[PDB]
Amino acid sequence: XXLXXX
């Protein structure tokens, strides 16, 4: 999972 919340 990418860390960027969006």
Place this chain on the structure above:
Amino acid sequence: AVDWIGRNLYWTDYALETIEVSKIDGSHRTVLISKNVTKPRGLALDPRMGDNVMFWSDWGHHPRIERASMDGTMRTVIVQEKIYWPCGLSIDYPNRLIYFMDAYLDYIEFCDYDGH
């Protein structure tokens, strides 16, 4: 993070790359810290009189956890050595310890207000 003593509301913005403060009802709004802020996620406060410090975590190109006064004056860096993806902060008020996590090195750590 809300300030239950000063009646203020703090939040960190990833898109604006700022740390902002406002009243509990949101009447007045200003940008507190924007100088060296790149990707702020974590945020915690210690409003008890005598400490009056705030903490936040940044996962930019030089990730760090920084401490400053809740008015943003005495800005300093406490943890900069073994972090890659600082994600989430919290404060243990009775013992005056700050708990922080990392999503890349996958750990949970706690430390005092001065980073030692």
